[PDB]
Amino acid sequence: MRKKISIIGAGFVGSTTAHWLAAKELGDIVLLDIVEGVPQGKALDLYEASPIEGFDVRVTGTNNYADTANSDVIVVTSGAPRKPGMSREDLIKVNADITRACISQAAPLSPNAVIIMVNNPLDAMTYLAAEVSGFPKERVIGQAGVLDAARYRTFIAMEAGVSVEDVQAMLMGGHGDEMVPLPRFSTISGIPVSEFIAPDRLAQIVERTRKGGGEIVNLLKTGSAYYAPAAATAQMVEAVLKDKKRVMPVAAYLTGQYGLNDIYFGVPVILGAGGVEKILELPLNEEEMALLNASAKAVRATLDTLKSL
Amino acid sequence: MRKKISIIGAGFVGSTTAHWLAAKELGDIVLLDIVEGVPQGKALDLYEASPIEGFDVRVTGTNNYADTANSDVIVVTSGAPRKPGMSREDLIKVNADITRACISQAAPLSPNAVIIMVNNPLDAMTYLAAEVSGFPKERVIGQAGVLDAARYRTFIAMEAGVSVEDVQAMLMGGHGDEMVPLPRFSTISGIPVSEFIAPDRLAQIVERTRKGGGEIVNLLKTGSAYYAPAAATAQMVEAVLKDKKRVMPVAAYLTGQYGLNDIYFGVPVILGAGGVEKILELPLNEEEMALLNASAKAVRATLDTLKSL
Amino acid sequence: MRKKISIIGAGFVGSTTAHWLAAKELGDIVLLDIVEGVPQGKALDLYEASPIEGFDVRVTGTNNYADTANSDVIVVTSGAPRKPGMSREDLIKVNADITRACISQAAPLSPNAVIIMVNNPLDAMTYLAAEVSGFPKERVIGQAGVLDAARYRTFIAMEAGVSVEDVQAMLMGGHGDEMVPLPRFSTISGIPVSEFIAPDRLAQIVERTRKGGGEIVNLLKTGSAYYAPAAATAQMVEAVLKDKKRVMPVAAYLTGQYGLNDIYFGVPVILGAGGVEKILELPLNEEEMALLNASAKAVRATLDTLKSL
Amino acid sequence: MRKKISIIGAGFVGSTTAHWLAAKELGDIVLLDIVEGVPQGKALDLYEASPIEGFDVRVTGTNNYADTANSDVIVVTSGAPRKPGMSREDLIKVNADITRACISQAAPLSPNAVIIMVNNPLDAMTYLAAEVSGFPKERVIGQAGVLDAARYRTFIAMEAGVSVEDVQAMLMGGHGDEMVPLPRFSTISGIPVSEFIAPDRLAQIVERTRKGGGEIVNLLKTGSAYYAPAAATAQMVEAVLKDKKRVMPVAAYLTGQYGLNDIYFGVPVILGAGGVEKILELPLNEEEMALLNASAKAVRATLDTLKSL
Ligand SMILES: [Cl-]
Ligand SMILES: [Cl-]
């Protein structure tokens, strides 16, 4: 009995996540969407690559939540972009409705699953998925930090002229203005990044990381990033499926860590088959902690709007 | 000095091909398109996946053929779908113009490259690319058969209930009506496919292979297949870069094989760093040869229309 | 949780098999041997390679069968060496005692395991393993054919000038004089090997395959082959762990197939999570049957010697 | 054409390194040894695994240096074993003669190669290799630090309860008493190791790392480690062949870095197609410098013994 991964929402992120996972033979994959034909087509297309690439995975597309039953991991990409005229609460509302509909159908069919959210606003939707599923909180998480850390690591590897395999970095919070950069906690083969890159340039790289998603949006003209978001999501799925105990920034439920309670927030975790197996507590200095507290206030504000719906 | 692969046309097939190649660290990748922003965005997005996936490849996007210089392989996906009102010659004409423009700019900058075409009509455009580049014909080829054989192999593995790693198949010709199926030349770990699958069902699978591209089109609603076409293209690129001597059906220039002269046609080849290193001559029976001759007449008809432009 | 594989016998074959399973992150690995220190040493050495090779599995060396409990697959490599200069009968007696000691201790601790034997004489020892374990016959198999076919495929690829990835071959029986070669059931991308290689040369390749183990012994002057034997064994382990439904020659228990009853014999099977999920019955011609019947007589005589102990 | 790697010394380390390079299809491999039959045997065994493992590279065993011509990398593993019970000085004399014979024959045949030494005493033998070859110093390096760091990272990952993929560590000097441990320059996803592991336990881990080679020797009772030593060596080979710009400790020729001149010593470098492309100069504190200075004195004394031969 192979592992089973269901991916909800068969757009660019969801389908690319299926590609990364299939390539590694990580388990059978169900791609689900509301639109008829689209998940069926992408799934069959990917499956037809399998003799070339040498993986034995069933990739199927479906419009029926029944086909997601007994999944080991559920990935949710479904959501709604904002566009003009919408208020903050309007954007939160439409995504909350989408998230509730997905989780309320999927979770009871896979009571042992780890749920990985990849929609927006990420921390709030992960908080909602935890409420709706009623799963142990360790088993409901969100992907945000692995992507931002990946962009940062790319920029560092680029600038320092070194292998991307040798750059590691931790950060916290959400995306853009809510990101909590922590360049002190990044290294190249154990050596502080700040020994390779001077402060002014490092600050530019931190800012580029903040703006990294919008950078891609501006280039693509239509649509958002998907190759790296899907890679980040897939690395998380892998950590769960193989119990790898990866140390990653992940949206997790806090019970006093960093002085925060009753909130999902991007924090360093050990991630394995149990989901969040540890929340790590970094010795942040006053400047770093000021960044965290400001981000947590913003994340709290979004969460309060969700609760008031 | 890492290998260098340029991919012309940064749509679904071109960008997915970059993904398959990057994942295998096969060389630095240039993604080129006429549209500003789009190749830049997809390329940077893929590059930002690299610390997660562990590959050291430069992936860059560009609108400038100068950036393609000194490539080891050039992949061309650019072309034009037909839609209504267009005649046969009209469709051939617009793709010929696109193909000429791509090859005339790219080929002189990479005089040692192998050119791999993945546009339509595939055999005719490959014939044109050979004329325009003036390269040795062994170094100008087209991807068609690896995809159709992959779909067939998937269907066989599905039906027989066996690993896709154990199914192998040769076929000839082009796509759909121009495909020349050869189920006699397919095996599961050395054992004829016909020992696993009875004639009526095997005929259904052959027909499904013929219709395999349109199957995906019908499901997707908008757009065509890309995961498997890109995998096929990337496997060909790999064969060249690593001199693997893969035995594959490929659109190649014929000088008497199967009784055909002065034509590109899908035939079994040994594919390596020299491009086509051998054209294999199968002992086709009368029924198989009748299929080939009918397909070659159709491919000839397209080629004659190209020549008359 | 993670898959678990126990490998009994920490010699070259056992240790090299462990390396393969671990590199691929196929499961936690227990390496057991009677000699204190040796399995612990090899396991720790392999484990210390993990941050370089990027795998997260436990690799335990042990002298205690208790550490093998609840394994998904048991591999047995323990066996008297070299065809040591004793009688054929002496070899069977010493290996029967080893096999009985190994299986009687390991089997009760892993009642749902698939057992894969890799000692000598291969078919007889697999028969004894079935007897001692009491397991369903589908779950006790022997590795022999995958190695012999690998050597054959290597020789074929080299001679035909093609990729090893494109050569398939089925064969039957045991090793050496007991191998039943089947060049009719071998192909290159679905094309008969006989179309590439002339009959005299092919006969040489067949003979080289029979003598292939001894060719390696003679070169080394001390010890036997282990790289290809371990790869063959690991591939079978993988087939079970990932439920891949590989089509392979393996030593299986026969109940009438090919006219053979109450015997282990190398036959084509579908191998998956259930062990042998199907024994395939090839339409062997008169010549091929003569080879098989002679092979079986010899395998029977080995088995009868075992039964008379 | 394909990359070419020659590995001198067909023992456990050389043969296992070959296995790694081939599995990854990194280039054609030549395994050379003085003993007739042994390298031919090991090479053929490895080659016969290729259709199972899916790699297309040539794997040649030889007694003739002519077969190593025009290699991209030369790996030297040939060396007197075990710290054999002779004097320290005896060990240097025997290995100096072996190293001189190896380098004087191989270097002129591959004038553009990078040489990677893996014999003992490591720094001295790499110094001698530079002398005998006459190659630019950047192209003659020794593998030691990558192994010692791998053992350290293994121990750290196990103790902290995290993925080996997320642990980085830099260290300097040679093996054993000459290792310069640097736990300050080690991290888990960019976070200082000191935050995870208490000082007393970390000190134990450091000592285990110093004794790590001997720990393996004592368990095995015959022979030394080879899995992790070969992985470390292969990773360095890969860094050169794929121009990955890895940041690694390697034995490099010093001209003033860390106060050291005219000596080979384990230092952090950027390693790529050009060999050592940069020697990094860490801001070592007073305590760390004392370790380094003592290490250097000892490495100097080994070197002076070599110079007095
Ligand atoms: Cl231990
Ligand atoms: Cl040979």
Author numbering:
A (entry chain D), B (entry chain D), C (entry chain A), D (entry chain A): 1 to 309
The authors write:
Among the few cytoplasmic enzymes isolated from S. ruber, the tetrameric malate dehydrogenase (MalDH) remains the most extensively characterized, at the biochemical and structural level. Sr MalDH shares more than 72% of sequence similarity with its non-halophilic counterpart Ca MalDH. In our follow-up crystallographic study on Sr MalDH; we determined the direct effect on solvent organization due to its acidic surface, by using a comparison with a non-halophilic counterpart.
For this purpose, we solved de novo the crystal structure of the non-halophilic Chloroflexus aurantiacus (Ca) MalDH at 1.7 Å resolution. It allowed the determination of a hydration shell consisting in 945 water molecules, which cluster themselves in large networks of structured water through pentameric/hexameric polygons. The asymmetric unit contains a dimer, the physiological tetramer being generated by the crystal symmetry operators of the P3121 space group. Moreover, the mobile loop (residues 83–89, following the linear numbering of 4BGT) covering the catalytic site, as well as the residues of the N- and C- termini have been modeled in each monomer of this new Ca MalDH structure. The most interesting feature of the water molecules in Ca MalDH structure is that 28% of them are organized in polygons (pentagons or hexagons), which can form extended clusters. These polygons are only observed at the surface of apolar residues. Around apolar surfaces of the non-halophilic MalDH, water molecules cannot form direct hydrogen bonds with the protein, and thus organize themselves as polygons with their nearest stable water neighbors. As mentioned, large networks of connected water polygons are present in Ca MalDH. In the same protein region, no water polygon is observed in Sr MalDH, which possesses four extra negative charges compared to Ca MalDH, due to substitutions at positions 199, 203, 283, and 285.
